[PDB]
Design an enzyme around this catalytic site. Structure first.
Site, PDB file in Angstrom:
ATOM      1  N   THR A 180       0.827  -1.200   0.000  1.00  6.38           N
ATOM      2  CA  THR A 180       0.000   0.000   0.000  1.00  6.38           C
ATOM      3  C   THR A 180       0.863   1.252   0.000  1.00  6.38           C
ATOM      4  O   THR A 180       0.645   2.168  -0.802  1.00  6.38           O
ATOM      5  CB  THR A 180      -0.933  -0.001   1.211  1.00  6.38           C
ATOM      6  OG1 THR A 180      -1.733  -1.187   1.197  1.00  6.38           O
ATOM      7  CG2 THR A 180      -1.837   1.220   1.187  1.00  6.38           C
ATOM      8  N   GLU A 223      10.481  -6.169  -0.970  1.00 11.71           N
ATOM      9  CA  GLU A 223      10.479  -4.716  -0.849  1.00 11.71           C
ATOM     10  C   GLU A 223      11.364  -4.012  -1.874  1.00 11.71           C
ATOM     11  O   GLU A 223      10.990  -2.902  -2.295  1.00 11.71           O
ATOM     12  CB  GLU A 223      10.872  -4.312   0.577  1.00 11.71           C
ATOM     13  CG  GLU A 223       9.805  -4.664   1.599  1.00 11.71           C
ATOM     14  CD  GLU A 223      10.093  -4.100   2.971  1.00 11.71           C
ATOM     15  OE1 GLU A 223      10.034  -4.867   3.952  1.00 11.71           O
ATOM     16  OE2 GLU A 223      10.372  -2.890   3.073  1.00 11.71           O
ATOM     17  N   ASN A 273       9.474   5.830  15.413  1.00 10.91           N
ATOM     18  CA  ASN A 273       8.546   6.839  14.915  1.00 10.91           C
ATOM     19  C   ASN A 273       8.627   8.126  15.730  1.00 10.91           C
ATOM     20  O   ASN A 273       8.499   9.223  15.174  1.00 10.91           O
ATOM     21  CB  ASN A 273       7.127   6.278  14.905  1.00 10.91           C
ATOM     22  CG  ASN A 273       6.966   5.148  13.909  1.00 10.91           C
ATOM     23  OD1 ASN A 273       7.793   4.982  13.011  1.00 10.91           O
ATOM     24  ND2 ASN A 273       5.901   4.367  14.057  1.00 10.91           N
ATOM     25  N   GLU A 318       9.022  26.960  -1.543  1.00  9.17           N
ATOM     26  CA  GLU A 318      10.382  27.320  -1.162  1.00  9.17           C
ATOM     27  C   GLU A 318      11.279  26.102  -0.986  1.00  9.17           C
ATOM     28  O   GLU A 318      12.507  26.239  -1.040  1.00  9.17           O
ATOM     29  CB  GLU A 318      10.347  28.152   0.121  1.00  9.17           C
ATOM     30  CG  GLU A 318      11.555  29.042   0.332  1.00  9.17           C
ATOM     31  CD  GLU A 318      11.222  30.280   1.146  1.00  9.17           C
ATOM     32  OE1 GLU A 318      10.021  30.495   1.430  1.00  9.17           O
ATOM     33  OE2 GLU A 318      12.156  31.036   1.496  1.00  9.17           O
TER      34      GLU A 318
HETATM   35  N1  LIG Z   1       9.808   3.730  10.485  1.00  9.02           N
HETATM   36  C1  LIG Z   1       8.754   2.921  10.400  1.00  9.02           C
HETATM   37  N2  LIG Z   1       8.712   1.964   9.408  1.00  9.02           N
HETATM   38  C2  LIG Z   1       7.652   1.137   9.304  1.00  9.02           C
HETATM   39  C3  LIG Z   1       6.592   1.235  10.195  1.00  9.02           C
HETATM   40  N3  LIG Z   1       5.687   0.290   9.854  1.00  9.02           N
HETATM   41  C4  LIG Z   1       6.149  -0.393   8.780  1.00  9.02           C
HETATM   42  N4  LIG Z   1       7.371   0.117   8.436  1.00  9.02           N
HETATM   43  C5  LIG Z   1       8.232  -0.302   7.320  1.00  9.02           C
HETATM   44  O1  LIG Z   1       7.436  -0.412   6.158  1.00  9.02           O
HETATM   45  C6  LIG Z   1       7.821  -1.533   5.387  1.00  9.02           C
HETATM   46  C7  LIG Z   1       6.610  -2.429   5.159  1.00  9.02           C
HETATM   47  O2  LIG Z   1       5.558  -1.689   4.581  1.00  9.02           O
HETATM   48  P1  LIG Z   1       4.211  -1.308   5.385  1.00  9.02           P
HETATM   49  O3  LIG Z   1       4.068   0.195   5.514  1.00  9.02           O
HETATM   50  O4  LIG Z   1       4.201  -1.967   6.746  1.00  9.02           O
HETATM   51  O5  LIG Z   1       3.067  -1.971   4.455  1.00  9.02           O
HETATM   52  P2  LIG Z   1       1.757  -1.181   3.945  1.00  9.02           P
HETATM   53  O6  LIG Z   1       2.095   0.182   3.390  1.00  9.02           O
HETATM   54  O7  LIG Z   1       0.785  -1.058   5.093  1.00  9.02           O
HETATM   55  O8  LIG Z   1       1.139  -2.069   2.744  1.00  9.02           O
HETATM   56  P3  LIG Z   1       0.591  -3.579   2.933  1.00  9.02           P
HETATM   57  O9  LIG Z   1       1.531  -4.548   2.256  1.00  9.02           O
HETATM   58  O10 LIG Z   1      -0.772  -3.675   2.287  1.00  9.02           O
HETATM   59  O11 LIG Z   1       0.488  -3.889   4.405  1.00  9.02           O
HETATM   60  C8  LIG Z   1       8.902  -2.262   6.163  1.00  9.02           C
HETATM   61  O12 LIG Z   1      10.147  -1.941   5.591  1.00  9.02           O
HETATM   62  C9  LIG Z   1       8.821  -1.678   7.556  1.00  9.02           C
HETATM   63  O13 LIG Z   1      10.097  -1.596   8.138  1.00  9.02           O
HETATM   64  C10 LIG Z   1       6.626   2.197  11.200  1.00  9.02           C
HETATM   65  O14 LIG Z   1       5.694   2.301  11.996  1.00  9.02           O
HETATM   66  N5  LIG Z   1       7.714   3.042  11.296  1.00  9.02           N
END
Ligand SMILES: Nc1nc2c(ncn2[C@@H]2O[C@H](COP(=O)(O)OP(=O)(O)OP(=O)(O)O)[C@@H](O)[C@H]2O)c(=O)[nH]1
Ligand SMILES: Nc1ncnc2c1ncn2[C@@H]1O[C@H](COP(=O)(O)OP(=O)(O)CP(=O)(O)O)[C@@H](O)[C@H]1O
Ligand SMILES: Nc1nc2c(ncn2[C@@H]2O[C@H](COP(=O)(O)OP(=O)(O)O)[C@@H](O)[C@H]2O)c(=O)[nH]1
Ligand SMILES: CCc1noc(C)c1C(=O)Nc1cc(C)on1
Ligand SMILES: CCc1noc(C)c1C(=O)Nc1cc(C)on1
Ligand SMILES: CCc1noc(C)c1C(=O)Nc1cc(C)on1
Ligand SMILES: [Ca+2]
Ligand SMILES: [Ca+2]
Ligand SMILES: [Ca+2]
Ligand SMILES: [Mg+2]
Ligand SMILES: [Mg+2]
Ligand SMILES: [Mg+2]
Lengths: 438, 425, 54, 352
Positions: free
Chosen positions: A145, A183, A228, A254
């Protein structure tokens, strides 16, 4: 006053969005119920904080934000969290099943069926703006997503808001805190389709945030909460100029002007200091020179790389707290004669400095200790291209065997879009090398 | 609300399935009557994944019991947690399958399949958002193998975009009921290659040797072999049944473990495995050392004979998540010659705070290894040893099958072995 | 090492220090991509059903 | 159990290091494209530094310093010396040099002609040597017209520097020579000077009235063994080690190698490496670097030492491979990956 609409896509964007709006409230004195005692204009006004908060007749200050996820588990935390009262239901959009870490699924299969609803909710917030500047979009590279749906949303936003700016806060994938091997695909797919639609993108590598939490905060196994709360500090430092009185980076326009002379190279490196463990007995407070010098240490960059072996196109210094221009200029002169700061010949060799007297706000019970002064440097270095190299390499290893590709074609994506996106990255890497190497 | 629909078919499928519901029902605090009596909210957070909620706070498993004879299912209904299952969800015939794939797939099974689907359809229509299906069965029999694969083919037709996972007990001459098991297993393997997303290959010889050599059971029984399958099924599904580690999604797990559609047959593992020196505490290094040792592998395949495409490990218990990463990185960074280098970071680890019953901590191994080709090679050589003389074919040609169908099953699985071979170099 | 564009306000100030001088797709085209991918999904699912009918 | 990769099959040096590491029984080699490595013996050109230090749980070490080419390039070294205040333009140990780009391509053509015209008028020695890094292609001439016309015929950058018209000659023979000093810099930036050097001597008598025959003017090992007819006459392979050379300086000049030459060598090595430390140091970097350097010096009749060039991928003397390669494992590799003397190096202390 001109409004800014924040958009949080996927788990990463939503969780990070949650940590930032918590910080925005503590910085502007907005309580969880939305009330703001300091605001003397009840139910209206065009103050600097109104770029991010609208106001109701009841005196409630509502973020100009939208949350979007194909699965409700993460957004459900916002609906029942401490700040559940800031937002109303229209702002929190959730599907029933996610993209399964599959770009094609978030962009095509599921994205196509929910895009027109998201746009309708964004339009509602836009209708409340008398002079909308643009959008701040938070998301991850790795999520299906965060990557797949974001690129589709960015394409439509350019169609519905042509003259508006769009900045990203993108989470670069780090295996240490990731349970998905595809990823690298998603990142390169989303960077390919988003590139021509984003005016300025701030990449945060979870690897960098992870080791800063272990090294500086003595957190052995950092959680997303730890990460976070740290990311939201940096994000707060980057958006402070839009929310407070000032004359530097007063509008989203800017940012491209001051940080991006070349459109495709719109990924500024961020460096922040100091990050002090709140559990520490009591740390010696650093000076303007000590924290400024720290901005040229790799250990505090949001993306690990060696700026000594790149060329700068721009450099911004954003101070918060007890800082006067005299001390900034003194530290800069000292860093020049000691550091390796090679600018591109077609750019000036200079620093834009912004000082906000209010020192960084700390989240009660957080990990960060209160400091008298902090700085965030935004520098457009060709050294950040190292991150693209690492990422493009992993893509090549898997794609050469077409590993996992069938999951993407199965959602309606053509295989060729892979190579079409990879070629774009190969061009992006070549652009950096023409700008930084001799 | 990501629900899973469970199906167990045949003698082996219903006995292993029964133990599975026996094990996890104890973890979620569900008694043999369906009433909850645990002490933690984590026992109910993801409870709707495998249980439907009835009136009076009752939890009825979302399971469908299928067989072509009554005997086994009569036992389950009389067994420990037999009363917990939905009465309507028992679907069975009287003729039996005679350990004949054709009877399960074309004749006896076909007469009963439509009614089994009416129950599957009923269970799915109540799911807020159906995640996918799981099937427990053996490949060497007639019902679980022949009718089981028929059920999968028709379930995919009606739910083409839901995940289909199976736990498949592969036959072995060392633990054999009849000489035609290679025939039934080769015909099923082709159905699985086509119509499942994940298949957990469980070799009855591997289960036997573990009971004999490791657990020191002098005379293992099917019940002993099923205790291992129970614990393994609970391990691989822990991340789905308890909170904490998001991404716990069937499709998401398939997306990251299956780089190629046909190569979706996993080697499961489990640690610890101790004979009765059973109270000794198990350190994290020991957990990792055992979880990766072949003797804890349940597919009777030597991982050192092939290469890992993807690995998923789930640690259970209150342990140092820091020390877990250290030992996992130690296994990879000390044997990286057995992991393909064209899938970066193809080893992932998840932790879980709730340990199984009677274990301070445990680890479950899920490997997509190219050494699994050794298993299909065994079954293929046994198939050919009989098919070359057309021995025992008449049991099948008498149910309407032709020799050509056997020849194509042969070729389909030899192709499956060729695919695993090209990715091993 | 020159300071220029010094702006001061109650909540801070900002300036610029120069050390050295220098030397899209339409709404129709997006819908076509979204509909083309859906057409390739429908074609793949039809072949899967055609296979199941045989 | 440590792991390392090999990405330079042409390195005679690290071929021995790779041999010794495997002998320890505690190091395992991996394919050249395996990221899970502790040690990279990387290629020469285009070493992907940007992919190092990103593997969770692996401390990674590489045998090249990113940015050291600034010192190990003909043109880069000249620019580094003239622009670095640490070395200044008035550097006394580096021959007067100028960077000259061919006319088919900043450039110091006129600046060189000004100093040249000054010498030609002041009756001083006006012999120069033109060279470049793209050579096996060297020219020694006393006329500026020949030097410039020679570079224009090429297509790569060249460097013109003053030719030492009064080089120290060994006796018997009356022959030119240069000294090769191997220097190792570990991940902590400790500068170690291998106690064993080698003099690459010419087996032909030095002739200052004929720069056309470059057999007695250039002391390259490949030149003497191919175009010199007296190769191996005075010393085996035209290689005199410090023991004999020190004994010679005592019998002829009544001085020692340490006092007359080694002090100047150790001083030059410090100034060069300390100069670029802030630019190549990996103290606070996500990965660690170490590199072996091969310095080349010249000695004149006054016993003054001049710097010729620095080699970033040098080879060792046949007799010293064992001792030196082993030394690399001790101070450079095992210092970061310890295994379950009388150091052969001379630590040159300095301020970081
Ligand atoms: N910094 C940070 N990274 C996150 C967090 N949650 C997920 N990630 C990173 O995001 C990546 C995975 O994507 P997600 O954002 O969890 O997945 P999504 O956008 O919800 O999409 P889906 O596959 O449908 O679940 C991984 O590399 C995680 O390390 C967060 O709360 N903070
Ligand atoms: N300015 C100068 N004065 C006197 N001799 C010089 C000189 N420049 C070069 N030489 C001669 O040339 C030789 C060194 O050449 P140079 O090192 O530039 O070429 P090269 O790099 O291909 C050999 P290597 O790198 O292996 O040491 C020395 O033996 C020296 O005698
Ligand atoms: N692990 C295990 N395997 C079994 C069990 N019962 C039968 N099998 C195996 O399953 C195969 C026989 O299939 P079976 O289930 O009895 O036939 P079906 O009832 O017609 O499906 C043989 O290979 C047996 O070894 C059991 O309880 N546990
Ligand atoms: C570790 C438990 C887990 N929980 O959610 C997911 C998704 C996983 C998982 O196994 N992810 C993997 C495995 C490989 C190889 O690549 N990614
Ligand atoms: C597991 C018990 C069992 N139940 O039905 C069968 C058939 C067996 C079986 O094969 N038993 C074995 C195997 C060896 C060797 O000796 N006895
Ligand atoms: C991909 C390996 C894995 N790793 O963590 C989990 C959880 C799994 C997994 O897929 N578990 C299940 C449950 C059913 C039914 O089928 N598969
Ligand atoms: Ca107001
Ligand atoms: Ca645009
Ligand atoms: Ca009948
Ligand atoms: Mg998600
Ligand atoms: Mg039976
Ligand atoms: Mg050279």
């Amino acid at each position: 006053m001109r409004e800014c609409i924040s958009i949080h896509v996927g788990q990463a964007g939503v969780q990070i969005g949650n940590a930032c709006w918590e910080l925005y409230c503590l910085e502007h004195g907005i309580q969880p119920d939305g009330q703001m005692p300091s605001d003397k204009t009840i139910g209206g006004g065009d103050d600097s904080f109104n770029t991010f908060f609208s106001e109701t007749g009841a005196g409630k200050h509502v973020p100009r934000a939208v949350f979007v996820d194909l699965e409700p588990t993460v957004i459900d935390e916002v609906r029942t969290g401490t700040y559940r009262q800031l937002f109303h239901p229209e702002q929190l959009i959730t599907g029933k099943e996610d993209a399964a870490n599959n770009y094609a699924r978030g962009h095509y299969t599921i994205g196509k069926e929910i895009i027109d609803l998201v746009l309708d909710r964004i339009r509602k917030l836009a209708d409340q703006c008398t002079g909308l500047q643009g959008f701040l979009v938070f998301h991850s590279f790795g999520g299906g997503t965060g990557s797949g749906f974001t690129s589709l949303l960015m394409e439509r936003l350019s169609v519905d808001y042509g003259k508006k700016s769009k900045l990203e806060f993108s989470i670069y994938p780090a295996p240490q805190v990731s349970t998905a091997v595809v990823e690298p695909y998603n990142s390169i797919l989303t960077t390919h389709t988003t590139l021509e639609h984003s005016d300025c993108a701030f990449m945060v590598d979870n690897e960098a945030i992870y080791d800063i939490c272990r090294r500086n905060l003595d957190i052995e196994r950092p959680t997303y909460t730890n990460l976070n709360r740290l990311i939201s500090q940096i994000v707060s430092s980057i958006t402070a100029s839009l929310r407070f009185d000032g004359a530097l980076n007063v509008d989203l326009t800017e940012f491209q002007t001051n940080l991006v002379p070349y459109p495709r190279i719109h990924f500024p490196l961020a460096t922040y200091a100091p990050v002090i463990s709140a559990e520490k007995a009591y740390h010696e407070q650093l000076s303007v020179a000590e924290i400024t010098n720290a901005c040229f240490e790799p250990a505090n960059q949001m993306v690990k790389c060696d700026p000594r072996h790149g060329k700068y196109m721009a450099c911004c210094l954003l101070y918060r707290g007890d800082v006067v221009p005299k001390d900034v200029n003194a530290a800069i002169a000292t860093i020049k004669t000691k550091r390796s700061i090679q600018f591109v010949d077609w750019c000036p060799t200079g620093f834009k400095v912004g000082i906000n007297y209010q020192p960084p706000t700390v989240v009660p019970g957080g990990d960060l200790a209160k400091v008298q002064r902090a700085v965030c440097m935004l520098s457009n270095t060709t050294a950040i291209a190292e991150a693209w190299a690492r990422l493009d390499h992993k893509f090549d290893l898997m794609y050469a065997k077409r590993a996992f590709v069938h999951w993407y074609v199965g959602e309606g994506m053509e295989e060729g879009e892979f190579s079409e996106a990879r070629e774009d990255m190969a061009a992006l890497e070549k652009d950096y090398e023409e700008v930084g190497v001799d | 609300m990501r629900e899973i629909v469970h199906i167990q078919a045949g003698q082996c499928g219903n006995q292993i399935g029964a133990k599975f519901w026996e094990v996890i029902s104890d973890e979620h605090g569900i008694d043999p009557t369906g009433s909850y009596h645990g002490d933690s909210d984590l026992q109910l957070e993801r409870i709707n994944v495998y249980y439907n909620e009835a009136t009076g706070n009752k939890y009825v498993p979302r399971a469908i019991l299928v067989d072509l004879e009554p005997g086994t299912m009569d036992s389950v209904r009389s067994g420990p947690f037999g009363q917990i299952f939905r009465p309507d969800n028992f679907v069975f015939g009287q003729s039996g399958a005679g350990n004949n794939w054709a009877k399960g797939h074309y004749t006896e099974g076909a007469e009963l399949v439509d009614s089994v689907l009416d129950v599957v359809r009923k269970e799915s229509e109540s799911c807020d958002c159906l995640q996918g299906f799981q099937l427990t069965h053996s490949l060497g029999g007639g019902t679980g193998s022949g009718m089981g694969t028929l059920l999968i083919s028709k379930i995919r037709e009606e739910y083409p975009d839901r995940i289909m996972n199976t736990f498949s007990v592969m036959p072995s001459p060392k633990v054999s009921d009849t000489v035609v098991e290679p025939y039934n297993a080769t015909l099923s393997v082709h159905q699985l290659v086509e119509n499942t997303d994940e298949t957990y290959c469980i070799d009855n010889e591997a289960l036997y040797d573990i009971c004999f050599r490791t657990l020191k059971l002098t005379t293992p029984t099917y019940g002993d072999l099923n205790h291992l399958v129970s614990a393994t099924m609970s391990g691989v599904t822990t991340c789905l049944r308890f909170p904490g580690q998001l991404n716990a999604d069937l499709r998401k797990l398939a997306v990251n473990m299956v780089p190629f559609p046909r190569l979706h047959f996993f080697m499961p593992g489990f640690a610890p495995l101790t004979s009765r020196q059973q109270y000794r505490a198990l350190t994290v290094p020991e957990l990792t050392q055992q979880m990766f040792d072949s003797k804890n592998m349940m597919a009777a395949c030597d991982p050192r004979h092939g290469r890992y495409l993807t690995v998923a490990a789930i640690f259970r218990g209150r342990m140092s998540m820091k020390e877990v990463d250290e030992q996992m990185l130690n296994v990879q960074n000390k044997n990286s010659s057995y992991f393909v280098e064209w899938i970066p970071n193809n080893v992932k680890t998840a932790v879980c705070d709730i340990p199984p019953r009677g274990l301070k901590m445990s680890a479950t191994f899920i490997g997509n290894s190219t050494a699994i080709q050794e298993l299909f090679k065994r079954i293929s050589e046994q198939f050919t040893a009989m098919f070359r003389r057309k021995a025992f074919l008449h049991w099948y040609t008498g149910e309407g099958m032709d020799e050509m169908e056997f020849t194509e099953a042969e070729s389909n699985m030899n192709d499956l072995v060729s695919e695993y071979q090209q990715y091993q170099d | 090492m020159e300071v220029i564009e010094l702006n001061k306000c109650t909540s801070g100030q900002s300036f610029e220090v120069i050390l050295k001088p220098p030397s899209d797709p339409s709404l129709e085209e997006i819908q076509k991509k979204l509909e083309a991918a859906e057409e390739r999904r429908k074609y793949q699912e039809a072949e899967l059903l055609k296979h199941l009918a045989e | 159990m440590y792991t390392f990769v090999v990405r330079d099959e042409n390195s005679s040096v690290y071929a021995e290091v790779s041999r010794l590491l495997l002998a320890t029984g505690q190091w395992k080699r991996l394919r050249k494209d395996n990221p899970r490595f502790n040690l990279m013996l990387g290629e020469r050109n285009r070493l992907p530094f940007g992919r190092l230090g990103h593997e969770p749980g692996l401390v990674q070490l590489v045998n090249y310093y990113r940015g050291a080419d600034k010192l190990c390039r003909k043109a880069s070294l000249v620019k580094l010396i003239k622009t670095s205040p640490e070395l200044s333009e008035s550097c006394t140990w580096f021959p007067e040099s100028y960077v000259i780009y061919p006319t088919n391509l900043t450039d110091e053509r006129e600046v060189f002609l000004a100093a040249y015209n000054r010498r030609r008028e002041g009756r001083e020695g006006n012999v120069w040597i033109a060279k470049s890094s793209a050579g096996a292609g060297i020219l020694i001439s006393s006329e500026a017209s020949e030097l410039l016309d020679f570079i224009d015929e090429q297509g790569q950058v060249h460097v013109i520097q003053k030719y030492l018209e009064k080089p120290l000659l060994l006796e018997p023979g009356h022959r030119k020579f240069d000294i090769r000093s191997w220097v190792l810099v570990d991940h902590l930036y400790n500068i170690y000077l291998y106690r064993e050097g080698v003099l690459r001597t010419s087996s032909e008598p030095y002739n200052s009235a004929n720069f056309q025959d470059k057999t007695c003017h250039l002391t390259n090992h490949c030149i003497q063994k191919e175009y010199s007819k007296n190769y191996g006459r005075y010393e085996e392979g035209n290689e005199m080690f410090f023991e004999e050379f020190n004994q010679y300086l005592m019998d002829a000049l009544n001085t020692t190698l340490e006092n007359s030459i080694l002090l100047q060598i150790k001083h030059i090595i410090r100034s060069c490496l300390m100069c670029i430390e802030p630019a190549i140091s990996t103290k606070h970097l996500h990965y660690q670097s170490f590199q072996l350097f091969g310095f080349d010096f010249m000695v004149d009749e006054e016993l003054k030492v001049w710097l010729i060039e620095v080699n970033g991928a040098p080879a060792c003397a046949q007799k010293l491979y064992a001792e030196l390669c082993q030394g690399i494992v001790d101070v450079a590799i095992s210092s970061v990956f310890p295994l379950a003397p009388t150091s052969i190096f001379i630590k040159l202390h300095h301020h970081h």
